[PDB]
């Protein structure tokens, strides 16, 4: 089952997350991690906010200390793995043996082809090199074009914005945030942000680029002073293609994190798993499966009598004034919306069912109604929609009673 | 690796191409095969043609003689696996121990949920079972009615017209054979069932079913004496989801057809595997792949040196006058015809490129060029588009040349 040693490869929070409790379940055997970046290991969502705007890494770093007895060889790339002889090959030139090897290696942002030979600065935003490079080019009155409609990039609009700089935003969908967002939450978010100040265009095609200037699949022109390419990420699984397993952008695996060749197990970003509300495989890019499919993967390697990974999805984003909460799924058959939709003081909460039964929930400035939300939507419940709309109606109380 | 005894679940074409090759490969353990069928193997394809036409099971069944020394459990359904005691539990109350675990379940054909409670013969055409009681029903100047735009129905639209039975089809896309097929095929067969009598209504949905009258969502009405539906088929992966492997309609296995629980492999209709063409995961649900993935499969047990499957996708479809072939990718960048496309005598050749290289192609009526053609896709081969389309150029000299 759980054999020694342990190898990990990648440090991001999927992998922190994963190691820590191994040694909180009690595994004393070796751990090694392997990652890429020389950096100690750090949290993503701040990049896009507090440190793009404040810029102290040291106040982003993970916690180790639930970690002991860890050796971490940063700034190191893994660049095979032999499944048979298992062992791991290293980019300075080390082999590391493994009973029990852990994919945790993320996922990279997707290029933009069109931008490709582009002589304009064009930049991704992922790792702290990234934030650090962008940060340095948030000059007041500066323009910044940011290339697609997901949370990252409406994350570094909103700083960026606060920060004086004037931003337009292209968008190939109808809509901003097009996965996992209620077209209800969508629609007002670009409401927000068009409020702000930024320039949005929407069913546009970046078509390539030509001395500072960005050209449209419209006929059209866009001049910036830097491009921030958020358009997705791919997963990083190279190492699993060539060594075999199933993948298809990401790594197969079951709630166990079991990949299809035995002793290799993933977790993370680079996954592509069960989605328990939709029962499809999806791969599930937030922060809160990262930790938490690492923790039950964890788990059950230290002791198989704990249950698979059963967690439903969420996520959070922070942009500007609105501090968004989105668990489950996007629709349902119906929606009720609790509180007044309003750019004066918002604060809503929409809630989607599926024949009667909970399958999603958003709240926008309002974290007191999302816990009980959750709770409500991890046992499907199916509460009076009555109810659910009357404003007088206590949500918490919902989830006891 | 290949730990005896081996046990397969399943006794269709997959199961006996993989336990065949287990044999011949050397493999002299002990394998024990369930199927939950009471029939000696069989093949599938003549139940839409000729046994619908003439009736002779016995001209269907699937030689064995290549696996010797097979205990065949006929008419026995397994209802569950314990993946950790190695345990097959059966319907008829024993218990099978495995080293290796098969799965070969193939699918069943989706219902039509709005002719759920209809009170007029609905069948499937997936068993012998099945085609006996519709073959029992092709009373010349009936009237059938086929739902879904698929091969399997409009083979046996083909074999239903040619026994004086009136047909009328419903297809809720716009062309016929929307899964992998070129257009221009599609068109043509389109074409082709028309000609011979088949009346077809694209783009219409059966919304359910009166006494004795179908439904549509155009508001309108369809009588029929009997209604086969063929609306696609979704994976038996039962078993697997409970036993706690990956599946999303599908088991999802590698090129050596293992599952991501150990010990335990799938094989043909059942599976979700990589198609190398398009670098994507798909549930290939071809005659070809139950026989080659089945043998690959078995090969690399026996052998760990042999390769993966490697195999490219083909199929063909006997529709009367139309032998239809099929491999590869249905569209690309550039599509070459060969040949005119016509009704008077049809014989033709597509060839679909992308970047100059081969993905796919399609004969009707030309089978002497469908294997060179095949054998240029496997090596993606960059032939002279020119050359290609000149009539007087040999396919089968250019596989060599
Ligand atoms: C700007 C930004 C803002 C975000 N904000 C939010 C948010 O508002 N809400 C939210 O839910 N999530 C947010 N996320 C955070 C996010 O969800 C987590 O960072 C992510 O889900 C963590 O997953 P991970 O550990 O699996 O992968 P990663 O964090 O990508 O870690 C994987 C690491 O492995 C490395 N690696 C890859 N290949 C190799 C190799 N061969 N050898 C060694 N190392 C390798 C990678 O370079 C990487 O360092 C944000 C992310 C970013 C970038
Ligand atoms: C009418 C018809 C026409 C066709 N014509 C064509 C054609 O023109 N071209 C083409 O390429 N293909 C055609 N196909 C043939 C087809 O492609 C093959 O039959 C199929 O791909 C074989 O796959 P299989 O062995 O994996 O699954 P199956 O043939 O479905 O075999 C699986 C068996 O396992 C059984 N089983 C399921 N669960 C259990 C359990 N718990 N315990 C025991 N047994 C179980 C099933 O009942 C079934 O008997 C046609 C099929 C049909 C039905």
């Not at 078509?207 to 791919?234: E, N, P, Q, W, Y």
Request: charged share 20%; aromatic share 6%; glycine share 10%.
């Amino acid at each position: 089952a759980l054999k020694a040693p342990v190898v990990v490869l990648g440090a991001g929070l999927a992998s922190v997350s994963f190691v820590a409790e191994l040694r909180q379940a009690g595994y004393q055997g070796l751990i090694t991690v392997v990652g890429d970046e020389a950096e100690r290991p750090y949290d993503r969502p701040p990049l896009s906010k507090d440190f793009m705007a404040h810029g102290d890494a040291e106040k982003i770093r993970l916690d180790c200390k639930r970690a002991p007895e860890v050796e971490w060889l940063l700034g190191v790339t893994a660049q095979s793995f032999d499944p048979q002889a298992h062992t791991v090959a290293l980019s300075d030139g080390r082999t590391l043996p493994y009973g029990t090897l852990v994919l945790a290696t993320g996922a990279a942002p997707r290029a933009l082809p069109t931008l490709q030979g582009a002589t304009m600065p064009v930049h991704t935003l992922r790792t702290l090199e990234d934030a650090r490079r962008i940060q340095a080019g948030l000059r007041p009155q500066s323009r910044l074009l940011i290339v697609g409609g997901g949370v990252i990039g409406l994350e570094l609009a909103a700083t960026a914005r606060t920060a004086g700089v004037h931003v337009s935003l292209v968008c190939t969908g109808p809509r901003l945030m097009s996965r996992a967002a209620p077209a209800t939450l969508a629609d007002f978010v670009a409401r927000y942000h068009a409020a702000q100040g930024v320039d949005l265009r929407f069913e546009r095609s970046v078509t390539g680029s030509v001395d500072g200037v960005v050209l449209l699949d419209d006929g059209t022109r866009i001049a910036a002073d830097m491009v921030v390419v958020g358009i997705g990420v791919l997963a990083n699984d190279a190492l699993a293609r060539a060594a075999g397993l199933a993948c298809d952008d990401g790594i197969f695996v079951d709630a166990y994190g079991r990949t299809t060749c035995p002793d290799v197990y993933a977790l993370g970003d680079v996954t592509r798993q069960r989605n328990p509300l939709s029962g499809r495989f999806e791969r599930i890019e937030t922060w809160s499966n990262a930790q938490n499919q690492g923790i039950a993967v964890a788990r059950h390697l230290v002791d198989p009598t704990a249950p698979g990974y059963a967690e439903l999805p969420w996520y959070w984003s922070d942009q500007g004034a609105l501090r968004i909460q989105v668990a489950g799924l996007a629709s349902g058959d119906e929606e009720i919306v609790r509180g007044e939709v309003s750019l004066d003081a918002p604060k809503f909460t929409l809630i989607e069912l599926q024949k009667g039964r909970i399958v999603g929930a958003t709240c926008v400035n309002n974290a007191r109604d999302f816990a009980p939300l959750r709770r409500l939507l991890a046992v499907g419940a199916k509460p009076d929609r009555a109810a659910l709309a009357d404003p007088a109606t206590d949500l918490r109380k919902l989830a006891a009673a």
